[PDB]
Amino acid sequence: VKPNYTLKFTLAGHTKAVSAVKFSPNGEWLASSSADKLIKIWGAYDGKFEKTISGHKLGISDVAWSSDSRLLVSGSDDKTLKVWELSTGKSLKTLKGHSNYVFCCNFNPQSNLIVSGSFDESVRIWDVRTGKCLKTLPAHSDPVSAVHFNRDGSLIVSSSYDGLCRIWDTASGQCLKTLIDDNPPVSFVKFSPNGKYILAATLDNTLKLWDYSKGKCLKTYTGHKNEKYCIFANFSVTGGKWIVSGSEDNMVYIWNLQSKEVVQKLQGHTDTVLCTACHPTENIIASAALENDKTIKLWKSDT
């Protein structure tokens, strides 16, 4: 059982490193964020440039979609987050309160809340309607690399360069759990679609799939290079069950979720592949890379 992603489109337009790429939940759009201070929207199936969204003062490190594909949230080195209305390009709110670069962000499923993580070592939960910060969690002792809500919004996972991965009760703000052999920086983390497992990446060229309730590592995936950058990893579940991640050898890696065999390496980028994302219904992968490449690529497979 094995995939065959082939290159279909290359999208260009960013003038600096592309920091994140993300499909709209409705499957129609691809958003990209960049150090060039911009967000760009592309048609998810044809890769056709849709529009540019501007307003951040400095580069953007992450960008994310509301549940209804109408809004987007971004986090910037200008210490703020901004909520965008897709259809109009408006900056509806500007979320202020972090004391250093905002690195990562996400809506909850209900999309009435946003979670953020920052170089200032905190995780914040914001009210989407009022733009006010509801809670500041003193989550880590080093910059916060990723944040993500589980399926029903009850839980938040964070990760940090301090080597910890932590689970938080959304309602109370309490730390319910802390994952722990060495303490290599944790560069990325994300719940599984069903909310039972946690995919985590560490700066020792390793991805691990955790059962977070039992606090035990169930799978480990290697072959890629990852010692420097906070690279996105994904579950691909529309066809075969894969793990998908970028890599510092300019290649997109695809593992079999069960066997942990590398089943495909997508070639064609000319710098570190920092971001990847999986389309929600079709077997379509998006990828994008750093300063020396700056292009976004779309790949499709029959499985």
Partner: peptide, 8 residues
């Protein structure tokens, strides 16, 4: 030993 990531 196979994990399901979609279903509850």
């Amino acid at each position: 030993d196979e994990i399901d990531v979609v279903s509850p």
